[PDB]
Amino acid sequence: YAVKLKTDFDNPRWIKRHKHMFDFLDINGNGKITLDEIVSKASDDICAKLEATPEQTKRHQVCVEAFFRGCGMEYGKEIAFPQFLDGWKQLATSELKKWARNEPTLIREWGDAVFDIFGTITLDEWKAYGKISGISPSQEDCEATFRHCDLDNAGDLDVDEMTRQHLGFWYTLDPEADGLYGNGVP
């Protein structure tokens, strides 16, 4: 499949996908999130539970920082959803230009850092990620991810494929990427 490159930023389904994610990040329900919180979730929570090495944690942090700065986040900056979504439009545009240029995207580099903590991850690793990050705590959802994606010869997921899927899921609302997270993310 050719990844869908055209954006669809006014589609209510793309809005809802990021709204779901925003509200998941807004744990205290006050309508605003900060880079501080996102990086703490990355480093203090996820990497600790995954038992990442100090270096892996740092590398992952740098990637999370760059990724979310790309959507307008910053330390001490309290962002509400409309500005966050505007940031995602900018991130998606920038990422697609990199993709066109065959330059690694920030979503790819984040994936590299996640995968390294685990270029392939197993279903059981993905199920753990889903619980620890909280993005997909249902193991059935994680099974759906693996059904959905094109897997390697062992039934494992490669970062190139996950990145293709994430371009379509997070940036372009590619129908080929629908269901990447099962019912865990709309």
Residue ranges of alpha helices (H) inside the chain are 12-25, 35-40, 48-49, 54-69, 81-100, 106-117, 123-133, 139-148, 159-166
**Structure-solving method:** X-ray
In the residue annotation, 148 being an active-site residue is answered as: no
Give me the residue spans of the domains in the chain: 1-186
Q: Which residue in 126, 166, 170, 171 is the catalytic one?
A: 166
Length of the chain: 186
Write down the residue that tokens 């619980």 correspond to: 131
Catalytic pick from 99, 129, 170, 171? 129
| Superfamily (CATH) of domain 1-186 | EF-hand (1.10.238.10)
> Of 14, 88, 170, 171, which one is the catalytic site residue?
88
Whether residue 88 lies in the annotated active site: yes
Q: This structure's resolution (angstroms)?
A: 1.2
3-state SS class at 161: helix
